[PDB]
Amino acid sequence: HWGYGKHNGPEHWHKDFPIAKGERQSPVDIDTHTAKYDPSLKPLSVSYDQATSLRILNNGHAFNVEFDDSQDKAVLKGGPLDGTYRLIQFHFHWGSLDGQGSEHTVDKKKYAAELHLVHWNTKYGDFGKAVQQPDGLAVLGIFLKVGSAKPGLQKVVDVLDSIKTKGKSADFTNFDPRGLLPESLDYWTYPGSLTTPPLLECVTWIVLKEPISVSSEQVLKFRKLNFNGEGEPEELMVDNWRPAQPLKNRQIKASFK
Ligand SMILES: [Zn+2]
C-alpha cells in the first residue's frame, strides 16, 4: 500500500506509520562542517569471506540479495558498534536520473544511488527481535556515482531481468559482497531509522565517505525494473529513495579528520 508514488509516498507515510515524524528518522543530510571527527571511533571490521548469499528477490520497492544469517558467516564489528552484527541482506535505492537516487546527502549533494548492507545485532537472537531495539541494526551505506564499471556488481546486474516484476525471486549463491566496497572505509555515523516503513528507530548508520563508481550500463539495468507485478501496467522502479529528514537533536560523527 505504501510506496514512492505521489499518493502513497514518503510525504504520506506518517499517516500509517506515525514514527515517520519521530526524533531519529533516516536519512539525513550530512553537513561536513558540523559533522566533527571523533578519535574514539574505532575502524570498521568486516569478515565476509564465509558470506553465503541465498537468493535475490523483487519485493516491489527494491531488490534484496539475502544471506544465510544462522551463523557469524558475514559480520560487521568495531567502528561505533559493540558486539557482532550479522549481514541479512543488501539492496539499493536509485533515481530516474543520474543527479539523484541517494537517501543520505553530503552537503546537499545527491548521488546516483545508495547501497545498504543490513546487519543485525547477535545480542538479540534474530532479526525480528533486533528491529525492536535502538541498538538492534547496523546498516552500512555506500554512495554510487556513475563512471567506471564495478566488476563485483556485474553478477547482480546479470540476473536482474529474471526478477523484473514484484514477487519474482531467483537463486543467487556464491556472491561476494566485498566486491561492492570502495577503497577507503572512512565513515560518518549517527543513530537513525529504517528508511522504509515500518521506519523503526533501530539503526546505527555507518555511511562511507568514498563513493563506488558504477557504469552507465549498470545503473540503466536497475532502472529497467518494475514496481508492478507481472501483468499490471508498467511502473518502472525508479526514485525509490526517501528525502533527508530533520536531524533534530542528533550529532553526526566522522571517523576521519
Ligand atoms: Zn535501504
UniProtKB/Swiss-Prot annotation:
List GO terms (cellular component aspect): apical part of cell; cytoplasm; cytosol; extracellular exosome; myelin sheath; plasma membrane
- Cross-referenced InterPro entries, in alphabetical order? CA_dom (IPR001148), CA_dom_sf (IPR036398), Carbonic_anhydrase_a-class (IPR023561), Carbonic_anhydrase_a-class_CS (IPR018338)
A GO molecular-function descriptor: zinc ion binding
Q: Which residues bind Zn(2+)?
A: 91, 93, 116
* Activity's dependence on pH: Optimum pH is 6-8.
Q: Result of mutating residue 61 to A? A: Reduced CO(2) hydrase activity, rescued by 4-methylimidazole (4-MI). Reduced proton transfer. Enhanced proton transfer. Enhanced proton transfer capacity
- Primary localization class, coarse: cytoplasm
Disease annotated for this entry: Osteopetrosis, autosomal recessive 3: A rare genetic disease characterized by abnormally dense bone, due to defective resorption of immature bone. Osteopetrosis occurs in two forms: a severe autosomal recessive form occurring in utero, infancy, or childhood, and a benign autosomal dominant form occurring in adolescence or adulthood. Recessive osteopetrosis commonly manifests in early infancy with macrocephaly, feeding difficulties, evolving blindness and deafness, bone marrow failure, severe anemia, and hepatosplenomegaly.
The protein's role, per its UniProt record: Catalyzes the reversible hydration of carbon dioxide. Can also hydrate cyanamide to urea. Stimulates the chloride-bicarbonate exchange activity of SLC26A6. Essential for bone resorption and osteoclast differentiation. Involved in the regulation of fluid secretion into the anterior chamber of the eye. Contributes to intracellular pH regulation in the duodenal upper villous epithelium during proton-coupled peptide absorption.
Protein name in UniProt: Carbonic anhydrase 2
Write the lineage as a comma-separated list. Eukaryota, Metazoa, Chordata, Craniata, Vertebrata
